[PDB]
Amino acid sequence: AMLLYTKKDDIYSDIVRMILLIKGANAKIVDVSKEENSKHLEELNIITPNGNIPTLSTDDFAVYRLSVIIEAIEDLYPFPPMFPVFPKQRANARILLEYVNKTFLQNIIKLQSPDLDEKQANEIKMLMQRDIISTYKKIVSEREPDAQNINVLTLIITFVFYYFIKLKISIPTKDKNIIKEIKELLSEPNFIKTIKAK
């Protein structure tokens, strides 16, 4: 059966859990930061090279790295699709996913590290604050049709705004429409469901 090794307040764990929810995969979610899951943590370090979090464990394999976890979930559960189904658009989305991973997701992890300086933290916060709206506008520009499903980029950008709040970083916009849209993302039923899954 499907098992997801998670960790508390980890943007990557959260993203994969929401993906698994939308895909309708009935996965066992195990938080290895909890002392009762100590045995699952021991297993993780046997099946993975560095006890990587998150880890999606299938009957046939164990995967780590967000883009690889997504691809493995998509191979086994293609519906609803997380990426565009046409080559050009698919390529663009995967490149934009890499940009969001590098610019936001990796930096969110850095701000949560105990070995973080005052200089380093302000560099990261300034960086993410500068591009966040530009990236958000670019993700919605790619979408530019009712009862339709969400894409992996909208799903991930929602978690970026959620972690901005979590890290007490203000979302830099005065635009009423963008504010309404961000509030609409943060109130998506599957996002709430994932946030209250703990």
Add this chain to the structure above:
Amino acid sequence: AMLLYTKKDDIYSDIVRMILLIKGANAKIVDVSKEENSKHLEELNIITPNGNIPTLSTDDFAVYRLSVIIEAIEDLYPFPPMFPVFPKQRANARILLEYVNKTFLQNIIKLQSPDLDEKQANEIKMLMQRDIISTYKKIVSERAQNINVLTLIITFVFYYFIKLKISIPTKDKNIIKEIKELLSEPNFIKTIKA
């Protein structure tokens, strides 16, 4: 149109160039290290954060991370396939690609850096020498003769071992024959003489 920003004696450029050759992609390879076109190096530093080499550019994007370059090429040019068709094997290939990138590709580019002492260089060489056969055996263990991205990359690893005067640590006649067979692949030769 498709534009590839390359640099002389760069393992990553070589790998992408061979992939684009096999795919039959109509890309415009530009060697930024050449003075002939300084105009392209300027445009590269605008579209990328640190003028990263290699960079696969399109009218819609610029990509410089190797695994993202390989995925973007596969999305646009799926034939011939560079990855296993079944999910388990696909997942394993991508993980093994990351291992090869970290253990060898990144270490080859460190040995080519100007500010590097002989002590640091010996650490890297011995490290790469220890795992090269184990990794090679693992790539062939994963495997009518359609080349996949891991075999393509491991070929360039053995090519750069020779290029950096690092001996391939094996006495095994079969492995030696196989490495020699990799290094004589027509598209590899074609890429090396491009």
